[PDB]
Amino acid sequence: KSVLRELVTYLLFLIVLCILTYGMMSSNVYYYTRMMSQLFLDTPVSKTEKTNFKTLSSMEDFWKFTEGSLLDGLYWKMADNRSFIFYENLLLGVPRIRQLRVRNGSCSIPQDLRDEIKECYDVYSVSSEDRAPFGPRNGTAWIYTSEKDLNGSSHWGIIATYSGAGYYLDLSRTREETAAQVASLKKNVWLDRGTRATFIDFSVYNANINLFCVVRLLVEFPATGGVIPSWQFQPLKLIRYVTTFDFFLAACEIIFCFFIFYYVVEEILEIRIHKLHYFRSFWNCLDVVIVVLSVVAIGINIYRTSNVEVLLQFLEDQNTFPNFEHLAYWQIQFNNIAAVTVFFVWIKLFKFINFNRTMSQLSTTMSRCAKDLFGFAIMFFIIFLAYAQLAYLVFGTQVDDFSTFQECIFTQFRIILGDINFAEIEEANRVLGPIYFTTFVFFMFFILLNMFLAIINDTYSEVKSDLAQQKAEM
Amino acid sequence: YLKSVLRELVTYLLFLIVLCILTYGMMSSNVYYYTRMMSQLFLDTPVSKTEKTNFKTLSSMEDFWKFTEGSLLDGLYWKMDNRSFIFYENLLLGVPRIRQLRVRNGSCSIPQDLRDEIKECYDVYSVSSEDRAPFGPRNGTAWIYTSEKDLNGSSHWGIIATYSGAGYYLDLSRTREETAAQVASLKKNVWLDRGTRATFIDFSVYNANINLFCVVRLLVEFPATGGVIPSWQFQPLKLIRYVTTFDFFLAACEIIFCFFIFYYVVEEILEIRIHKLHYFRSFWNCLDVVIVVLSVVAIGINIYRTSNVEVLLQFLEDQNTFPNFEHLAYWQIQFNNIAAVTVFFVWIKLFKFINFNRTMSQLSTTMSRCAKDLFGFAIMFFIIFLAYAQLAYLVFGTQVDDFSTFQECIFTQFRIILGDINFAEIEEANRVLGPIYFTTFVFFMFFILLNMFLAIINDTYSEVKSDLAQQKAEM
Amino acid sequence: SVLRELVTYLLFLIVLCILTYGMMSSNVYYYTRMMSQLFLDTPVSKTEKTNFKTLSSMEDFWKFTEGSLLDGLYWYENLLLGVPRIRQLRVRNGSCSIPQDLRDEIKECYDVYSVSSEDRAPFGPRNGTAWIYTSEKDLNGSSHWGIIATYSGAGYYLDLSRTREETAAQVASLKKNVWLDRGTRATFIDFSVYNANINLFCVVRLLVEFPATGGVIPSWQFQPLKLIRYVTTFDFFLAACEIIFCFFIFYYVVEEILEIRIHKLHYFRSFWNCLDVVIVVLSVVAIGINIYRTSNVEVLLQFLEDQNTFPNFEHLAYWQIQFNNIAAVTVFFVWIKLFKFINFNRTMSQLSTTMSRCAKDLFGFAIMFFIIFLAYAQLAYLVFGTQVDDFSTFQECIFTQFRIILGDINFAEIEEANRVLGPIYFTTFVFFMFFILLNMFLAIINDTYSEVKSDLAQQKAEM
Amino acid sequence: VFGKTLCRALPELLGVTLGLVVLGVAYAQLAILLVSSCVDSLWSVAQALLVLCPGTGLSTLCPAESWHLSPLLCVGLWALRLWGALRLGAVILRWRY
Amino acid sequence: LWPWMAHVLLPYVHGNQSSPELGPPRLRQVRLQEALYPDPPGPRVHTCS
């Protein structure tokens, strides 16, 4: 029939998509980020200490790390020569440090307690930010600079979402000047009880391959006390057209755009002429989902690739901090969208695997049992969320694995796999601890897991029986 | 029941016993401990008394230079001209050899915008972009390119790329002092530049107590992005087979196996001449054809591997040179793989004869009639599996290291079912779409896919049992 | 008709449970864990870092013998029963044949340990008993079944002294003349302690094996034999429970014998009938070795007075381990026997009928499953049998595959040993084990259940 | 239908869970009379064909004054699942459905 | 316990920092009037007795 045309077009589209995904997911750049991370994250803060960035504990540990492993990993010795981190990775410009803090007096205390305590600082919020000079007010490290003046944006850290403003300092190109600047910052105390977040940003090039790398390290100081570190190493490609494979990838991208336009036109024409319902098929909703995701990806790529003005601005003055955070954010978004799109395109292959009596009856069984599976899955998920909310309310303050609701869901999903530690859950509560685990495992593996099998087996049996009886009695 | 099936059965058991004897005779114990002691001596030993770094945890070129002048010389030369015994039993054969593979400056195309500030670029390793020119004090074999043919080398297939057998090589000495002086002079002059892409160290030992050579090869890869990747290979071989009576017994068993294979070959060829032409509609015939092909390949490998032992004779003629025992080890590994595969297949061929009663016949029929539906559903199962693997490769392909490669993604997905993963690194790599992938995969893998397999098996078994019960009842 | 058997079995199970609790909190084995660290987990000397569990050379063994070993033997604080004994086994030079190709470069050649190629001639200064070969009978020895071979009870032995200085001087003399040459294959160091403060007896045996290639392989064995004594009424209550359990077996055996004079062979058709004999024989073996233990505890307890003779007591720890295993398995089997009795209702009746009807097909598919399991085990042994250390021997391969079924994979050594045909084996094994093969028992059980239920429903409606 | 079957197969599920309780108690008795023999070497078969509930993959052995009720229930219940004893429930439920 | 209090607890109470204590600490002891003869050190005893 006409399925041959659709199969050929879909195969060509899949080949183009696979070529594009193989091109974007290049050769081993895993080792690039691996070496960078192990250089900066796994290195102990000092020759005598055993703590690294991943296991920071207090603010003094942060100060030891700043004038320490960071300076060792940033400047490599080989008029004011530049720094090659592995004798290949070139440090672009200078790194930048930034601080976000709240103001004293953003915090209300009971009137009967205003005798022994005077100072309390609220949690981070845009309304309670501090926008006043402090300490020896000389430069940009003691003066508030707006988000617009810093060309910054939000971050969405772990505790909260942080603004793009704060008190910032641009370091130097040599180690001695940066060490002097950090010592001056530390001597005139810069991280007091009012601070709430600290960012460190820089970038490298690694001219051997054509792949920039952007590094951002964040440290959060919650109001309750402690230190929470996080990191981000992101590789980008901003000088794409260099080799022949780049031109091949560009041609493939143009072909992909043509394919997407053809699919959009076909979808519009085939929904407009007739079939006004069009949505009781599940093979037309998947098509529009794929089209929407691909159009979003194309728009993101078009809007991102044209905003390379930061590279041009940096290349004409190489003594300033280059702003590459927006490009990294949009690259991450594009990667997520492309991954989801390719997953759905691969899923779309089920429409064409019907070529013998064996493969047709399996599809018929799945389509017939989908309704019952959904009906039972509603109840299964209701019971699952009841377990999750009970665990969150009971163990959510002592176990480090039930601290958030989604973490409770993931913890139960891991309990199903058996990847859990029973020792921690029982010591949080001697009673109701073993009861929770026991009843969860029992009612999950003995009851809920078997109803799915019952439904699937009954549907498959009835489908095969009726098909065989009507086929053999014709 | 009849004479033909009894003859087939007795022939199959004779073949199975012959093959079991052959496999048991080549898999003697005390061979694992040889390689384990070798690895512990050479890998786990710290490079120096004042450092905790070993070969397995190399991190830079300075660490490599410390290891070469440190634990390597300590473990290679033992005291008691003179000869070196490793554990007072293992005799070091000839001299070790070091070799370097490097690329050339200017093998790139630096972008025009950044051309003013960067002047040197070295590409990743490739045959079309590798250096072939002298450098440094060009007065030896360490500073002069030697072609693959002139080195009697071959490819390696390391971690990052597949390296060539050529490069710049140096043959070390027999005593520790001369080797130390050679390495000191090779380090004082900068021999490992930014263009260096790979380094190999090769040697061998004998251990005359048992008759078992050992070949050791250590590789260090320098990626274009910086860093060091170490790898090792210890392999035991046997080149002087005919010594004891058990070796003669094994040779007789090999001849008997050759006769059995010839008999099977002639029977299969004579069968497909006119009688039942194009008989590939039976599973057992295809299994027999596969077994014959694998056995013929193994025999051909064995014939053209013990014949070319000329390298041993050349080394024994002059014991002051480098013994070349790499092709023999490679072909030994290939032969071991083929032998394992063929013994597994001849073992699973045993199901042709276990039909001595009604229970085994019913089970065999049930398994026979499950194959079509199981394959049909496995097609869909692997389609979904590959879709998930591609999604995980695209999402976590640069941070987790369990999804750094497509096959690594497949293996990690198979391990997830076993529940031996971390989920902390994959959750911190992507807070959204990371946990979604894990939860959705677990749900659709334990609740929708396993139950379908078991439902198919249950239905097929019930149908087969009902049909068989109706058969005899009607009889 | 069946109530008296139920009540007698309930009393028997209560007694067995009270004995099980009796031998569960005796704290006999934490004692040996505590003294394991004294000898095993201890640096050889002040400047070294390696202990007995991580020995890697002969010189390490010599440093340990005159170092950490001479600390536990001569002061928590314990008393040395008699004197410790150390002995070696060795092979003779020329026990193997050097190939003619390179016979001009290698002179000395030794072989793997074997009785056919074992040294029996004196060596060194033939003054003491450590330089003369004493036969197995003259040493009251037995085999050991070590890691790489089975060592006989003969060899070159030397019993130490009672004071630390004398033993140190004697082992220094053993150092002055080369006593561990290249011909030695294994070395045994065995003794026993007293520990007056808590009535615990410990038998210690440490073995160091020297392979034909090089290096050492250490092994240890600590066994706390205990002496029975009554002080309170609680342990006297335990003794009374022991005796009542003792003559429950007499009732069981006489009841077994009485009902066999009628039936000739019909006793073996019933599965529950062939379990009673297993229970009886297993329990009587356990009680026999237990009663033999006490007859050997005597004389042993008076051995610490002035004895300079070696306390040959290695024949008791083996039976102690066997007793532990027998007790565990008999507890499991009696609990299964309790599982027999639950057939009160009709639901339990149909479940029991289903199991009894599906047992035969379960056995057949078990045979097929074991065939496939052995095929994979042999493939794994031939592929990973020389690098991974989990497939070093065939039984290790079988146990590793069984552990893999229960989700205990490593996959790092498997990947490193073979980048291709390593992952293939793991993936195919997982797929064909967790999706096809293990899903075939449940099909048999389900079909048997369906047929039993249909038959019961059809037969009950008519009658 | 679903809940109906869950309230129609209750006696058979109760009988099956009684059998499972007996089997789990038997295993827990067997699995602690030989891990109490911790020392440094338990056995060959008993070391491989043994199940401990999730957590502490490498067994710490020697349950000195720590063989509380909760770990016994944990190990018995998890051993009941690994061996596929819980899947027997499907055998009932399917028929009822 | 006394060195631990000297090095950890006391700098935590009077060592002015965030989240003030709001109330002095206290140590409360029970005597039991039944001075116990301890088992010799070494193997553990079953919890308490």
Ligand SMILES: CCCCCCCC/C=C/CCCCCCCC(=O)O[C@H](COC(=O)CCCCCCCCCCCCCCC)COP(=O)(O)OC[C@@H](O)CO
């Ligand atoms: C000694 C006297 C009695 C001893 C009694 C001790 C027995 C100890 C407990 C057994 C369990 C009870 C029967 C269960 C069998 C029926 C159910 C069943 O077999 O389940 C399937 C196979 O599972 C499995 O592993 C199957 C493992 C083997 C159990 C099957 C029965 C073998 C019996 C062969 C001979 C019996 C007749 C001879 C006895 C005298 C699927 O599982 P599942 O999807 O969830 O995979 C999860 C994955 O993590 C585990 O592989």
Ligand SMILES: *[C@@H]1O[C@H](CO)[C@@H](O)[C@H](O)[C@H]1NC(C)=O
């Ligand atoms: C913080 O503000 C309070 C008033 O709310 C004031 O008493 C105190 O002196 C301030 N702390 C300083 C000046 O650091």
Ligand SMILES: *[C@@H]1O[C@H](CO)[C@@H](O)[C@H](O)[C@H]1NC(C)=O
């Ligand atoms: C923000 O970008 C502008 C260019 O549009 C630049 O002139 C300015 O210096 C940047 N802000 C900072 C703080 O460097």
Ligand SMILES: *[C@@H]1O[C@H](CO)[C@@H](O)[C@H](O)[C@H]1NC(C)=O
């Ligand atoms: C490397 O190549 C560049 C460009 O081809 C050249 O300018 C330079 O002299 C070469 N050598 C070195 C040591 O950079």
Ligand SMILES: *[C@@H]1O[C@H](CO)[C@@H](O)[C@H](O)[C@H]1NC(C)=O
């Ligand atoms: C390669 O083999 C030939 C064979 O005679 C030998 O002469 C030559 O020396 C070998 N190459 C090296 C580098 O030893």
Ligand SMILES: *[C@@H]1O[C@H](CO)[C@@H](O)[C@H](O)[C@H]1NC(C)=O
């Ligand atoms: C070992 O025996 C061989 C047999 O010829 C002899 O040549 C050699 O000298 C002996 N070596 C020792 C250690 O005496």
Ligand SMILES: *[C@@H]1O[C@H](CO)[C@@H](O)[C@H](O)[C@H]1NC(C)=O
């Ligand atoms: C060997 O056993 C016998 C019999 O008890 C004993 O007399 C002898 O002392 C033992 N060995 C010795 C020391 O000869």
